[PDB]
Design an enzyme around this catalytic site. Structure first.
Site, PDB file in Angstrom:
ATOM      1  N   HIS A  73      -3.369  16.801   6.257  1.00 35.52           N
ATOM      2  CA  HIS A  73      -4.414  17.829   6.532  1.00 35.52           C
ATOM      3  C   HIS A  73      -5.888  17.642   6.355  1.00 35.52           C
ATOM      4  O   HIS A  73      -6.500  18.165   5.366  1.00 35.52           O
ATOM      5  CB  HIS A  73      -3.894  19.206   6.264  1.00 35.52           C
ATOM      6  CG  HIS A  73      -2.946  19.931   6.682  1.00 35.52           C
ATOM      7  ND1 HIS A  73      -1.521  19.828   6.374  1.00 35.52           N
ATOM      8  CD2 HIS A  73      -2.583  20.349   7.923  1.00 35.52           C
ATOM      9  CE1 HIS A  73      -0.731  20.408   7.069  1.00 35.52           C
ATOM     10  NE2 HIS A  73      -1.438  20.759   8.243  1.00 35.52           N
ATOM     11  N   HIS A  77      -6.918  14.620  11.157  1.00 39.22           N
ATOM     12  CA  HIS A  77      -5.979  15.817  12.049  1.00 39.22           C
ATOM     13  C   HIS A  77      -7.026  16.580  12.629  1.00 39.22           C
ATOM     14  O   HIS A  77      -6.718  17.038  13.722  1.00 39.22           O
ATOM     15  CB  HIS A  77      -5.144  16.330  10.937  1.00 39.22           C
ATOM     16  CG  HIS A  77      -4.378  17.601  11.585  1.00 39.22           C
ATOM     17  ND1 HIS A  77      -3.631  17.612  12.282  1.00 39.22           N
ATOM     18  CD2 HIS A  77      -4.714  18.904  11.261  1.00 39.22           C
ATOM     19  CE1 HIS A  77      -3.141  18.670  12.803  1.00 39.22           C
ATOM     20  NE2 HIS A  77      -3.785  19.730  11.963  1.00 39.22           N
ATOM     21  N   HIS A 113     -10.059  24.255  12.197  1.00 36.12           N
ATOM     22  CA  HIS A 113      -8.795  25.208  12.129  1.00 36.12           C
ATOM     23  C   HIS A 113      -8.138  24.748  10.916  1.00 36.12           C
ATOM     24  O   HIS A 113      -7.230  25.731  10.427  1.00 36.12           O
ATOM     25  CB  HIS A 113      -7.643  24.941  13.241  1.00 36.12           C
ATOM     26  CG  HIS A 113      -6.761  23.619  13.256  1.00 36.12           C
ATOM     27  ND1 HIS A 113      -7.398  22.296  13.295  1.00 36.12           N
ATOM     28  CD2 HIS A 113      -5.518  23.775  12.869  1.00 36.12           C
ATOM     29  CE1 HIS A 113      -6.334  21.600  13.193  1.00 36.12           C
ATOM     30  NE2 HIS A 113      -5.310  22.424  12.755  1.00 36.12           N
ATOM     31  N   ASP A 114      -8.189  23.711  10.244  1.00 33.52           N
ATOM     32  CA  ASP A 114      -7.593  23.450   9.033  1.00 33.52           C
ATOM     33  C   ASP A 114      -8.721  23.094   7.644  1.00 33.52           C
ATOM     34  O   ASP A 114      -8.031  22.602   6.602  1.00 33.52           O
ATOM     35  CB  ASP A 114      -6.789  22.348   8.976  1.00 33.52           C
ATOM     36  CG  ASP A 114      -5.219  22.568   9.426  1.00 33.52           C
ATOM     37  OD1 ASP A 114      -4.971  23.682   8.936  1.00 33.52           O
ATOM     38  OD2 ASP A 114      -4.486  21.699   9.991  1.00 33.52           O
ATOM     39  N   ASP A 231      -2.060  21.413  17.891  1.00 34.74           N
ATOM     40  CA  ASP A 231      -1.576  21.412  16.499  1.00 34.74           C
ATOM     41  C   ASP A 231      -0.423  20.587  16.398  1.00 34.74           C
ATOM     42  O   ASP A 231      -0.172  19.900  15.351  1.00 34.74           O
ATOM     43  CB  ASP A 231      -1.870  22.725  15.955  1.00 34.74           C
ATOM     44  CG  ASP A 231      -1.901  22.707  14.403  1.00 34.74           C
ATOM     45  OD1 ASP A 231      -2.368  21.656  13.750  1.00 34.74           O
ATOM     46  OD2 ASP A 231      -1.469  23.762  13.738  1.00 34.74           O
ATOM     47  N   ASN A 234       1.795  15.871  17.426  1.00 43.14           N
ATOM     48  CA  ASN A 234       1.928  14.463  17.042  1.00 43.14           C
ATOM     49  C   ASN A 234       3.267  13.843  17.758  1.00 43.14           C
ATOM     50  O   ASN A 234       3.136  12.660  18.291  1.00 43.14           O
ATOM     51  CB  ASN A 234       1.990  14.514  15.601  1.00 43.14           C
ATOM     52  CG  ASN A 234       0.991  15.003  14.542  1.00 43.14           C
ATOM     53  OD1 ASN A 234       1.268  15.235  13.701  1.00 43.14           O
ATOM     54  ND2 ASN A 234      -0.303  14.850  15.343  1.00 43.14           N
ATOM     55  N   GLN A 282      12.446  14.855  11.637  1.00 45.21           N
ATOM     56  CA  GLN A 282      11.383  14.908  12.878  1.00 45.21           C
ATOM     57  C   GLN A 282      12.520  15.310  14.049  1.00 45.21           C
ATOM     58  O   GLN A 282      12.017  15.684  15.116  1.00 45.21           O
ATOM     59  CB  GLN A 282      11.062  13.393  13.190  1.00 45.21           C
ATOM     60  CG  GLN A 282       9.826  13.244  12.352  1.00 45.21           C
ATOM     61  CD  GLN A 282       8.650  13.974  12.374  1.00 45.21           C
ATOM     62  OE1 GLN A 282       8.230  14.493  13.266  1.00 45.21           O
ATOM     63  NE2 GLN A 282       8.534  14.643  11.145  1.00 45.21           N
ATOM     64  N   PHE A 285      12.570  18.901  14.016  1.00 46.22           N
ATOM     65  CA  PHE A 285      11.272  19.404  13.958  1.00 46.22           C
ATOM     66  C   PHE A 285      11.122  19.450  15.732  1.00 46.22           C
ATOM     67  O   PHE A 285      10.509  20.577  16.362  1.00 46.22           O
ATOM     68  CB  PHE A 285      10.145  18.726  13.518  1.00 46.22           C
ATOM     69  CG  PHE A 285       8.699  19.082  13.543  1.00 46.22           C
ATOM     70  CD1 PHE A 285       8.541  20.400  13.455  1.00 46.22           C
ATOM     71  CD2 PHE A 285       7.762  18.245  13.973  1.00 46.22           C
ATOM     72  CE1 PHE A 285       6.986  20.705  13.482  1.00 46.22           C
ATOM     73  CE2 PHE A 285       6.327  18.478  14.083  1.00 46.22           C
ATOM     74  CZ  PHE A 285       6.110  19.726  13.826  1.00 46.22           C
TER      75      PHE A 285
HETATM   76  C1  LIG Z   1       4.604  14.445  12.145  1.00 46.18           C
HETATM   77  O1  LIG Z   1       5.639  15.441  11.655  1.00 46.18           O
HETATM   78  C2  LIG Z   1       4.900  16.825  11.492  1.00 46.18           C
HETATM   79  C3  LIG Z   1       3.704  17.043  11.892  1.00 46.18           C
HETATM   80  C4  LIG Z   1       2.994  18.193  11.565  1.00 46.18           C
HETATM   81  C5  LIG Z   1       3.862  19.157  10.930  1.00 46.18           C
HETATM   82  C6  LIG Z   1       3.422  20.660  10.452  1.00 46.18           C
HETATM   83  C7  LIG Z   1       1.917  21.094  10.192  1.00 46.18           C
HETATM   84  N1  LIG Z   1       4.232  21.413  10.259  1.00 46.18           N
HETATM   85  O2  LIG Z   1       4.329  22.726  10.086  1.00 46.18           O
HETATM   86  C8  LIG Z   1       5.407  23.324   9.111  1.00 46.18           C
HETATM   87  C9  LIG Z   1       5.032  23.720   7.764  1.00 46.18           C
HETATM   88  O3  LIG Z   1       3.757  23.927   7.713  1.00 46.18           O
HETATM   89  N2  LIG Z   1       5.849  23.787   6.637  1.00 46.18           N
HETATM   90  C10 LIG Z   1       5.375  23.872   5.173  1.00 46.18           C
HETATM   91  C11 LIG Z   1       5.954  23.708   3.990  1.00 46.18           C
HETATM   92  C12 LIG Z   1       5.854  22.175   3.483  1.00 46.18           C
HETATM   93  O4  LIG Z   1       7.441  23.898   4.389  1.00 46.18           O
HETATM   94  C13 LIG Z   1       7.938  23.086   5.262  1.00 46.18           C
HETATM   95  C14 LIG Z   1       9.502  23.307   5.280  1.00 46.18           C
HETATM   96  C15 LIG Z   1       7.295  23.292   6.688  1.00 46.18           C
HETATM   97  C16 LIG Z   1       5.114  19.093  10.657  1.00 46.18           C
HETATM   98  C17 LIG Z   1       5.701  17.568  10.718  1.00 46.18           C
HETATM   99  O5  LIG Z   1       6.973  17.242  10.788  1.00 46.18           O
HETATM  100  C18 LIG Z   1       7.731  18.237   9.860  1.00 46.18           C
HETATM  101  C19 LIG Z   1       9.302  18.044   9.900  1.00 46.18           C
HETATM  102  C20 LIG Z   1       9.468  16.791   8.752  1.00 46.18           C
HETATM  103  C21 LIG Z   1       8.435  16.530   8.138  1.00 46.18           C
HETATM  104  C22 LIG Z   1       7.235  18.002   8.611  1.00 46.18           C
HETATM  105 MG   LIG Z   2      -3.213  24.725   9.549  1.00 48.87          MG
HETATM  106 ZN   LIG Z   3      -3.476  21.841  11.800  1.00 48.22          ZN
END
Ligand SMILES: COc1ccc(/C(C)=N/OCC(=O)N2C[C@H](C)O[C@@H](C)C2)cc1OC1CCCC1
Ligand SMILES: [Mg+2]
Ligand SMILES: [Zn+2]
Ligand SMILES: COc1ccc(/C(C)=N\OCC(=O)N2C[C@H](C)O[C@@H](C)C2)cc1OC1CCCC1
Ligand SMILES: [Mg+2]
Ligand SMILES: [Mg+2]
Ligand SMILES: [Mg+2]
Ligand SMILES: [Mg+2]
Ligand SMILES: [Mg+2]
Ligand SMILES: [Mg+2]
Ligand SMILES: [Mg+2]
Ligand SMILES: [Zn+2]
EC number: 3.1.4.53
Lengths: 327, 332
Positions: A73, A77, A113-114, A231, A234, A282, A285
């Site tokens: 973040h 990003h 936004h972040d 957002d 990716n 992933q 996700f």
């Molecule tokens: C490239 O992959 C990702 C890219 C971005 C994201 C975001 C911003 N996700 O938002 C969910 C969140 O903020 N969480 C916040 C807290 C840490 O608890 C967690 C359970 C979820 C997530 C990505 O992959 C995931 C799945 C394995 C790795 C992360």
């Molecule tokens: Mg955010």
């Molecule tokens: Zn973001």
């Protein structure tokens, strides 16, 4: 070398821009370089009488307020979400739908936004009784804070990029930007998706195939989902870029998990460096969040997003291929 | 001290605090008799009344220290949104919670949340509206993104004061009791935002339409959604209770809100701003505006509450109607 940089910025209107190369070449200034390029490209400085030096001063101080030691973040990003929103705004299904002010709102929202993200989640901030969760009553804690910091920076010396907007325009822009950044809170994802699905079901298109969005509610709902898609873009990118994003988010998560472990807390899901599979994570996700969203966006703008959805589906099939499965 | 503060005679203050269970407690007398500590006095009385110190192992010195500090963060130079208004809303919530239709409906933690939310619900109020804070680009409106600006702030301050020396009245709650109370208090104070009044009332009318009652009139609430909605509307009714009170109280509350509104309109006029409705001391119709307030906001709300707890609130509604006629009869 400024030669190579301008060559990479040639791809600024294409999905899959090599944002990490731009970050290295620009001296870790991808957000400033990419925002400036896009504002030039869309003639935003002349439509809104933005002094180029005011724009650069604001962009550099904004970029400064993304944290270099936060693995995901950070300003790279931000620059990626900006450039992705820039591409989505130009999707044929939305041709001449949005005003220049709406376009400016969506790109500005993406850039801030972040900002000042600490590298930990809203739930972490709530569960640790953080000062930020106290200020924001446990509700969209980070997203409220990003907005407040992003607007606050417009008050620094020679940073008011909106100085030559009318009061009406400034008020409308502020409202849209708030509406957009608050929609990036993942706790709102299922409700945003449920409503986007219903908007698709009843969508109106001109004969030329361009969407018809009559009122503010329908317009802002499209901008909200479009920045939420950017957002969450990716896994829709070429695998060489997607792998680098996955490394960064897993580093950030594991750092949060380590703080949770230190503190005696339950380690959040996917935050335990010892007991996590990246590939499963992933694939889950994509299956439960990213693909349900993008297949709905793709429905909305059909067939504009088919190549994006194809890449997403290929990347899902790729990441699942080394997980043993019953055949 | 007997009542939580020192007073030049506890005997007069005691006879007034005998009305703490009655609508129309003389809250301005209590403020005078208590040396301008009505919030501390009334909260202490209620906590003892309801045995809340023993239920939640709240040390009385911690309760008094927190209430003193909280009371000090209501502005003494704001005419309406001060510690007397906070004390009034606390005490009115305390009467509403005792209404027969709610007998044994709420847990002690839900009661504590409603009363605590009432006490903090306007703390550090600056005497100007959310829209004034937005229109003037205030730091608070910047912090809170123009949404429930004051109500987010009152919550943040009320909770932050728990962290001062010997102020943590919730220190002996369990961690999940703390979490639950925090969520209910946030849900209640955010519902006091007047921009949410029409939505809140519409949902209350829906709850009244499908209300479930035992044989004796006691409400049957099924889950958190039901319970929090009743508490949200209860504290909102308490916040909007001035016109349902004995007329001499209502008359003073009207005098105070107009003084506060007029001082905001003076700030608007000084900055070349359009003066907000009902804030122009040069062009005011105080009596007509109270009748409008009752017809469009207060009576529709209280007639719906009265429906929910029927017939518990019938006298409150009759007083509202009589007070409406007072202001109607005094339009010049
Ligand atoms: C490239 O992959 C990702 C890219 C971005 C994201 C975001 C911003 N996700 O938002 C969910 C969140 O903020 N969480 C916040 C807290 C840490 O608890 C967690 C359970 C979820 C997530 C990505 O992959 C995931 C799945 C394995 C790795 C992360
Ligand atoms: Mg955010
Ligand atoms: Zn973001
Ligand atoms: C005893 O009377 C009143 C007691 C309390 C109130 C309160 C706290 N709130 O009312 C809404 C509000 O917060 N506003 C704030 C801003 C000035 O803009 C407007 C939309 C109103 C208002 C009372 O009477 C008022 C309304 C009719 C005559 C004066
Ligand atoms: Mg690798
Ligand atoms: Mg699927
Ligand atoms: Mg009991
Ligand atoms: Mg209030
Ligand atoms: Mg203890
Ligand atoms: Mg029910
Ligand atoms: Mg005139
Ligand atoms: Zn109030």
């Amino acid at each position: 070398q400024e030669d190579v940089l301008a060559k990479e910025l040639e791809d600024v209107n294409k999905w899959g821009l090599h944002v990490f190369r731009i970050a290295e070449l620009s001296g870790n200034r991808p957000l400033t370089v990419i925002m400036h390029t896009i504002f030039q490209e869309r003639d935003l400085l002349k439509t809104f009488k933005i002094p180029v030096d005011t724009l650069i001063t604001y962009l550099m101080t904004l970029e400064d307020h993304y944290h270099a030691d936060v693995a995901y973040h950070n300003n790279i990003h931000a620059a990626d979400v900006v450039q992705s929103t820039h591409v989505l705004l130009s999707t044929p299904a939305l041709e001449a739908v949005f005003t220049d002010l709406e376009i400016l709102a969506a790109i500005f929202a993406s850039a801030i936004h972040d900002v000042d993200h600490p590298g930990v989640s809203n739930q972490f901030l709530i569960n640790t009784n953080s000062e930020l969760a106290l200020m924001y009553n446990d509700s969209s804690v980070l997203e409220n804070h990003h907005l407040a910091v992003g607007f606050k920076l417009l008050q620094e010396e020679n940073c008011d990029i909106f100085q030559n907007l009318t009061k009406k325009q400034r008020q409308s822009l502020r409202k849209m930007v708030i509406d957009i950044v608050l929609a990036t809170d993942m706790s709102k994802h299922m409700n945003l998706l449920a409503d986007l699905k219903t908007m698709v079901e009843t969508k109106k298109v001109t004969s030329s195939g361009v969407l018809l969005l009559d009122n503010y509610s329908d317009r802002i709902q499209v901008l909200q989902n479009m920045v939420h898609c950017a957002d969450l873009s990716n896994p829709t990118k070429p695998l060489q870029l997607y792998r680098q994003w996955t490394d960064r988010i897993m580093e950030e998560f594991f750092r949060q998990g380590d703080r949770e472990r230190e503190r005696g807390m339950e380690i959040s899901p996917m935050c335990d460096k010892h007991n996590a599979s990246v590939e499963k994570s992933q694939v889950g996700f994509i299956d439960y969040i990213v693909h349900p969203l993008w297949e709905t966006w793709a429905d909305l703008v059909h067939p504009d997003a088919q190549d994006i959805l194809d890449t997403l589906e290929d990347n899902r099939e790729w990441y699942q291929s080394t997980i043993p499965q019953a055949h």
